[model samples]
Target: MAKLLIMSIVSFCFIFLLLLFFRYILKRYFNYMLNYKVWYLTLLAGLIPFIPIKFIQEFATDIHKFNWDSIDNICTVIWIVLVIILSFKFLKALLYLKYLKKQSLYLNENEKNKIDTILFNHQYKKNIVIRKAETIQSPITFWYGKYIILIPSSYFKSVIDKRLKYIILHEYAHAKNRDTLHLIIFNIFSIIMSYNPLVHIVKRKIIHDNEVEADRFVLNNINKNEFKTYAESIMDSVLNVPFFNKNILSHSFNGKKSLLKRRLINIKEANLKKQSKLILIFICIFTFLLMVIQSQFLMGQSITDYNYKKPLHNDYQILDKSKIFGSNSGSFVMYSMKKDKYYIYNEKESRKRYSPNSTYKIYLAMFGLDRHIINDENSRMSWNHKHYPFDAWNKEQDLNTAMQNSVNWYFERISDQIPKNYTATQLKQLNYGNKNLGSYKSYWMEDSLKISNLEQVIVFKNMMEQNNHFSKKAKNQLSSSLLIKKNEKYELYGKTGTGIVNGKYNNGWFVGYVITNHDKYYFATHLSDGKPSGKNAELISEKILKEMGVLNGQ
Candidate 1:
């Protein structure tokens, strides 16, 4: 529900902005009919969140399991209520139109012959019924093939031949342009996007533009001498009629103040340009391309895309200890090279992917060394002395010192040296989780390329096993830099990662392995929420290792 709500909000905002751009910017360059077609792009925008873009599937997963709070639930309820209210409002309008249609009288022979003559002149082939109704004030168009054109009995009796011809042509324009069906679609979209006032504004513009385009069509077909008569006819139709009740289901000929004035001005200017078939086609193609690019940026990957299935083995033990995790939700995955066994805590979370944060430095060092961006561990990169949140990052550092201090700038500079495509290929070859480097420079820093605890352990295991895929020299260099603790009985190698997600310090990681005289063990520990930092994860891992009798001494 929370994901749906977020998607709804994003879709509305995205489409609203596009609508504003089309209305304000593109309107000047394009004809009214072209501007009207651009509004349909909103329908495409609304579909963006649901499109399963293959590349963004991994990132989308994290949002799916989010725990909704009280405020979120309340807001969701309000959204649901608004949807219901808008739906009912549309339905009511539809029923009212149906009622009017039932009460209307069909065209007489004289009226049918007049309409046929106008249709023949315009090359319109579809048959239509011109209905005379006492309930309506102005001429309105409704329905598709075999459409109904409803007009007030008072107006029909009083209208002169020339004025009658223009009104009928206007209604025929709506049918030719499929304005009735388009209005229905727009009405449904409004209900879906009821939360946005801007959407309502765009909707009004759509209606206004539809009328303007129809007027342009009629004005272009008629003579300049008939223009004055046509303009007068529009005003006179509404002059003595009772105030018109707007119908959402149909397009009516009458408009008040601003809309009426604009329509008259547009007709008088006679500045309507004939839309080139090729230009209109190009506009549609350009709009579609924009939508595709926008969706690529908006919809990130799904969680399932990052999920890796390891080989099944019974040499795995599940350890459950509530006290070890405390108030935080976490997972621990350990692979013992000596025994060839896997021990895990919270297996579900162990498989879930999260941003690697600083732990990504381990791979960055490997990539830098393998690519020869940095010659050796002692090779230094001069600091630009840019202000940063961490003082340690403000100074120049080598690979070893940067890894030890988790200096973000050092790793960022090194990674930036290698081409992004090369880095992506290297990550894919290593089977890194997601294998997605979102942005060239800051991808691993809470951006993209997330890894699960299980995958982290797998990576460590591969590194310890002397995986011939990676250059031995580069692997050895990264391994030496990761050494943190040493003893007579055991040697510990690890890297810590801390990251803030959604304005909360929720992701912390301790990933590495312990080597002893007899065995080598690879482990990855992760914490979500409550004092999320590498130190906390390290302490938790230490306690769990001690309890399991995997590590004998401090």
Candidate 2:
């Protein structure tokens, strides 16, 4: 019950952050895109969240579940309610679209003829009609002829046919391109990218571009100089209509400065410029790259790994320590040496061992150099594609670059050269833990072997303190090879690992030891369901080190 409540609170807080963030982005970016009226409407929309969020919280609290059966029932009921509400909302929008189509009979014969000709010229086979409706908003469409070109009935009382043709052409262009479809697509995307202002801007830009493209078609084939006259006529007609808009993908003729820019650009044939084409190409490419990059980074599930097997003790002393210095769950082992005895806080059970995902480069370096597997004359490791499965493995990598980037292929190839038994033997000898190699697999291929968190700390402590465990040559080669960065005063060595298991989420692992003025301390941390190569563990570990007063050294 407590866990579910805590999770619910966290989920709610996360939702609020997302909502607030998107709201801020919308206000900041759309402020420039919108006129005062649109901004006011958007502000009102933002205020609507307070009511829904409050209701949701209270309702969720009422059904808060303390047990399995109740929680499942509550979750099912919530899901059904949400689904029903969403279905009704969609049905209402559909009815509105259908009604708009039914009522679009008021446009005159000349206006109707003008729309048909524009559609035919655009090769749009679908029959479409235009009408002056009671709609307060300027021109917009439903589907194709399901489209309604709503103009304030009184505003067009004295509008000229030539200027009217321009306005009709714009609406015809929307129907021809099936922009209603585009609007629907963008409306769905708005929810997915609800957190990004750029998404909203991009959607608006697309709509504006559709308008400009249509205008361009009209301007190129018709009279170019009269384009500005057409825009002026539009401004004269609907400038007095009170601005009310729909939240769904309803088409509107007058948008923000973005649309105005499109109008001005179309009027001037700005798109005809070579530089403009280049700029447009660059923008398209940039947007594509941004989409790809963000999708790769942002679109993934958070997986929870449960590998720790420790009894929960209610004593404050144990609980407080567990909260402070203990492993995140059963997946970690904590060990400390008091007097001559070694204490293992939690051992055994299948907790997540830091996989070294790719951070094994340091150990691989030590193993390869010490074993004389490759002539130690060169520090560069060849990048064979077969060795690293997850990343670009094409170029030769030096020891430092390989470690810095945490290249799995480079480490794997190096580890492959040393006999598998060598790693197993060394691990067993040092009591560095995790000696089970399972099959005849190479040391690099072993996955199930796990060393407890405390065991890792202890092994490092012993390696740094004891000289007899490793021969002088092995120690010197390992220490020098592992030393990542050095200055006039001190040196630092570290490694990182991350991996995603089948049916499991991502995990991050970090281990770093500092040597400054002959004082040494090691720190290790893991973030659940995070990329091992990520900065989270490094950040947390660094914070811990700084708190321990070790940033500048003892």
Candidate 3:
């Protein structure tokens, strides 16, 4: 959700900027109405983040020092406050409009007959109620309960029949085009995106084009010779008229300053070229596709996962026993490579992710050997002389010896020498859980890196299927280094991870695969809380394997 909010803000700004640029260029090719309608795509910008688009290979950010949740919440609070304040002002405007309407008089018989004659002559089938109001100084159109066209009491009495008809036509054109509703929607979007000044700029342009659209509608009903008189009427009546349309959901004949000049100038210009409905549809599709492309850079999702199933008929009998894990909660998951089936102990716990701990050494060694950072003869690392509680970690060690004892510094050094971006990308491609290496070094050790027991099984299997962009030589070396026990019937290969937080064992992981002459089996077991250790998890996994008939009692 936090990621969605950030993506929404960024994509809104991106799409709005693109729309602005296109509006400038598309003016010569498309008319005011088409240009006005193009901005409708801006609504999709806000909805883009809510969409679920999958990427085969999405980019992941290596650095995440900031708390994104805090930022998202702060932005949400600020946006809500602005929207409420703006909405309050609009509500006040609506109430005031209602008050003016209540005090105003309905049209007289003569005026009603004149309007009826004009409607018939003009072929406008809609019955729009016209009223005289003292508070208003310009002709405005809106829908309160029903359609309304309001004219100032002073202007209506002094205005001539011909000039009156022109003013009526302009306001009536607003109703015909449903400009009031459009204004309301435009303002709502503007209010919601009040933080981005770009949306307001776009809104202002949309409003301008709306008036231009309304002006053209009036011209379509009038004689070509009357165009000059129409322009003069706007300058004489609307430009010079006092108006009170503000913060209100209505269209007034008196537009904003500098807008009247454009409307007057546009009155005599050649018609803007209109476009096909098909092109409009194409733009919508293309804009949505652009949004999908933008989301690729914002977030990464794993494409690799197993075909999972819940255990039926007590399939978890051996692994879920209470005596094996006294005060700890654990999960056991195994995949049969030959038969391609998944067996699970606890379905929920198997899917939950925790820190990868030292078990990540398996993949780290593969990455190091894959990139030739360390190999058969050159795999040893000299210790920094940092004294440790563990005896094996205090001296020089090679890949085989380091992995055997789960030496922390050796793998940390291998990671330090590996290229950061390439490793991050490959980790995502491999679907190593979360794929976030927090703070760069030693991230797999109770840090930001995490993987679920089920995911560990899948990833371990993929790496050894020699799933390399990796050389066969690298795979062979890493495989040889990881071999713990081999018998005539089966060879067991795996890594153990122990998470020590504040000097207490909080997470335990045992992940590996056992290969036989005809079939191979992959398994991961994890224990959490209350003295769970990797060694205990390893013994427990062996028991579960025995129950599955993968091994004889040894």
Best by lDDT: 1
lDDT of 2 by residue, 327-403 (tens): 33322222222222222323342234544454445555666766765433566667533333334455676655666
Number of residue pairs clashing in candidate 1, backbone atoms closer than 3 angstroms, sequence gap of 3 or more or interchain: 9
lDDT of 3 by residue, 1-554 (tens): 75674677688777777877776666757742345766767667766766777557444434448667887789789888989998887788888767766786798877777777666776766666788777666766677755788787776577464777777777777777777777777777777666656666776777778788777877888898988987887778644644344735777766454665567556646757787899889999999999999987876555332223334321232345445656666878887776666676776778777777878898888888888878876888777675655788877888988888898888888889888886787787677778878776888887788888877777777776635667787777777787878887678888876888778888898888887665788888889866688888888787777767665422
Q: Where does candidate 2 have its weakest 10-residue lDDT segment?
A: 312-321
Runs in model 1 lying further than 4 Å from the true structure: 1-314, 501-503
What lDDT does candidate 2 reach at residue 52? Answer: 42
Backbone clashes in each candidate structure, one number apiece? 9, 6, 0
- Checking candidate 2 for backbone clashes, the offending pairs are 142-147, 307-351, 308-330, 308-331, 333-454, 498-532
Query: Model 1: per-residue lDDT, tens digit, 160-270?
Result: 545787888889888777877877788788788655555677677777777888888888878989778778877676653434545767777654455665566566676
- The better candidate by TM-score, 1 or 2, is 1
In model 3, the worst 10-residue window by lDDT is: 306-315
Candidate lDDT values, in order? 0.76, 0.53, 0.74
Better of 1 and 3 by TM-score: 1
lDDT of 1: 0.76
TM-score of each: 0.49, 0.36, 0.43
User: Candidate 1: TM-score?
Assistant: 0.49
